[PDB]
């Protein structure tokens, strides 16, 4: 609701960032391997952007990626709803 679907997105993005490094380390070639840029990747994913910076290459890496999209795109399909209603009515009055 208010700042609720917000919080779940944050749990998803941290754990997603975390699990990606665990899943991607060990596969030769992957650049999704340090906790910083792994987090930026999970934003890049939870939010449709597709910049082509980082992406997974292992199987378990893509699975962690799917978990983010669903749990993200849904959260963000609700977080921007809140922002919309909020500031639009705010500026109305």
């Amino acid at each position: 609701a208010a700042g609720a679907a917000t919080v779940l997105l944050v749990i998803v993005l941290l754990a997603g960032s975390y699990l990606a490094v665990l899943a991607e380390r060990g596969a030769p070639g992957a650049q999704l391997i340090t906790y910083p840029r792994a987090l930026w990747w999970s934003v890049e994913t939870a939010t449709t952007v597709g910049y082509g910076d980082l992406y997974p290459v292992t199987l378990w890496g893509r699975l962690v990626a799917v978990v983010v999209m669903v749990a993200g795109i849904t959260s963000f399909g609700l977080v921007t709803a809140a922002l919309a209603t909020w500031f639009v009515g705010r500026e109305q009055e």
Partner: antibody
């Protein structure tokens, strides 16, 4: 001393050996422990990483995989098991503490392994 | 496995004078290179991290330069306490690799 590992070991050819790395200081959930090998007068040969908390380890693709990594989450000490050695396997063996951001901030003093009878 | 290539192998110089070790990667790694100093008998020791930023507790002579595939450690002046082997180690793609090494000599 941050990363702490013993002085030197002696292994008979073909025998095994374990190696320690006890780390005072912090022991983060997110820390990794790596091991690097330095044959005398050579470069730094990366062997493998291990995240002691979660428990997974990843070894070096190219080299002859003689080793296997372990940890002790309630002792803050990590181990490396080298099995069946030759004298091509005599070198210094450091451990390093990588924060998760991709560099070896803290190093051990290095253990000197000597495979001979 | 990314190939880090440190040329030259050895480096002469006279004291107090700028010196630049070069490193060159087999492909583009961005800024994810890091420099380590290792003296005789001693363990390695981080110098520059992420190719430009500095470590807390490092002489300001050390200047981190470069990006892409060209990289440069640089020492704005030299003194006798800097004689060591120098290594670079990339973190851009698994697995982390190391350079060949470069030793620093002093003409005195």
């Amino acid at each position: 001393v941050q990363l702490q590992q013993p002085g030197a070991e002696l292994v008979k050819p073909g025998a095994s050996v374990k190696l320690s790395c006890k780390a005072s200081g912090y022991t983060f959930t997110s820390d990794w422990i790596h091991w690097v090998k330095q044959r005398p007068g050579h470069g730094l040969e990366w062997i493998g990483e291990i995240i002691p908390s979660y428990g997974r380890a990843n070894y070096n693709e190219k080299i002859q995989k003689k080793a296997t990594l372990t940890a002790d989450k309630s002792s803050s000490t990590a181990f490396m098991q080298l099995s069946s050695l030759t004298s091509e396997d005599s070198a210094v063996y450091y451990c390093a503490r990588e924060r998760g951001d991709g560099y070896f901030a803290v190093w051990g003093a290095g253990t000197t392994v000597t495979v001979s009878s | 496995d990314i190939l880090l290539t440190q040329s030259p192998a050895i480096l002469s110089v006279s004291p107090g004078e700028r010196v630049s070790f070069s490193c060159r990667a087999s492909q583009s790694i961005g800024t994810d290179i890091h420099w380590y100093q290792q003296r005789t008998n001693g363990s390695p020791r981080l110098l520059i991290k992420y190719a430009s930023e500095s470590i807390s507790g490092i002489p300001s002579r050390f200047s981190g330069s470069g990006s892409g595939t060209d990289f440069t450690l640089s020492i704005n002046s030299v003194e006798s306490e800097d004689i060591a082997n120098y290594y670079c180690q990339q973190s851009n793609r698994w697995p982390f690799t190391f350079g060949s090494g470069t030793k620093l000599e002093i003409k005195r």
